[PDB]
From a paper:
The fibre protein interacts with the host cell through its distal, carboxy-terminal, head or knob domain. The TAdV-3 fibre protein has 454 residues, of which 1–45 are probably the tail domain that binds to the penton base, 46–303 form a putative shaft domain with fifteen triple beta-spiral sequence repeats and 304–454 may form the head domain. Here we describe the crystallographic structure of this carboxy-terminal end of the TAdV-3 fibre and confirm it as a globular, trimeric head domain which, surprisingly, most closely resembles the structure of reovirus fibre heads. We compare the structures of the virulent and avirulent fibre heads, and show that, in both cases, the head domain can bind sialyllactose.
Residue numbers in the entry:
A (entry chain A), B (entry chain A), C (entry chain A): 317 to 454
Amino acid sequence: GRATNGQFVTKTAKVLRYKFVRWDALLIIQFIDNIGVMENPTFYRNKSIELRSADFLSPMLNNTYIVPLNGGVRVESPTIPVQLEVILENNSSFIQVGFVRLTVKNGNPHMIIQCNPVPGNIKMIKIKSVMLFTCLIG
Amino acid sequence: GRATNGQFVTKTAKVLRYKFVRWDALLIIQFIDNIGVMENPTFYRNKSIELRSADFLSPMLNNTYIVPLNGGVRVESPTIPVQLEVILENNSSFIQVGFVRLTVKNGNPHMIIQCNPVPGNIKMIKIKSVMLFTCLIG
Amino acid sequence: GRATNGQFVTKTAKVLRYKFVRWDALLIIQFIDNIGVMENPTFYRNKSIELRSADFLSPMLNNTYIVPLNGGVRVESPTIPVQLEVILENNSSFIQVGFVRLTVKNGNPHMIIQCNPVPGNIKMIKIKSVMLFTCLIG
């Protein structure tokens, strides 16, 4: 088939747009809000999916941030590594390889984001990578 | 098609279970032993594929650990990055981005795991990521 | 379908060979120049895609190296993480997780390679990973 639109919504009503192709047992899904572009012949701008403190579950354990989501598709994806920027409350920031999965809990999709220790509380995580998950359904 | 079960077996008779879809020229394969879950509404448990010293070939060179495998499918996959925990003989442990491929040697599948230097001998490598390889056959 | 050959060419006339499968809306493309092999029963050799200074655009900003390409397919891929070795002018070298995308600018394909700061000017970037992109067309 051709690519169908969809979205997830966060606790704070942020909308995470994606396109997907469902060929069961295969579901391939890309997030489309942050597709970077060359804005002129020599400059590449990255774009961020920006997730705030209030998008995550509390308490956070083991550098694992859980984003409960509503709507969208319901998959147990593999883990994909991403470029993260972790913004601390003191506006200090750390660039990291993050690891992202989609999982299902209580019939709800959740995005699992795992990263490294940071010296402070997190205000914001920015995903600077274009994320695509290839998933096996059943 | 829908997802078919399979497994690889290690030198020490550890069984590495996967599901795959074969649409030649495409083979997509996920390892399924360590699919993490949210065990309650706020906690995500990672699971490990645990590979011991005796699962690897000797001598090890250039932080490259080779796991000879029996059975399963026979692919030259791309490289996927993973979350590793490298357990040293002194039970010290290091969290790392590893890079994994499947390759074929002497008609046998081998899993290639590459990581960073550690200050000691390795007792165990745990893969904490859900691994899926998309492969091109011929 | 089965896997079709193709290539991209760099500013300096380096040829980057790939195989792909196009099932629109899906395009899956692997680079094939650097498929590593076990050369004997205990040794795995990585192979590099070697990109020189003159393959990149100037000026470089924010550890982002842009490789303008000619020919090949024209995709907005997701980001894939890779093993990089960054060779400096003083022949010092740094092993890094890089992040690679294919993007389109002025109807031309460009490879976007992003990595970490290095203490010097870059002479060469080697991609030691086998790269495969799964892409969504339209």
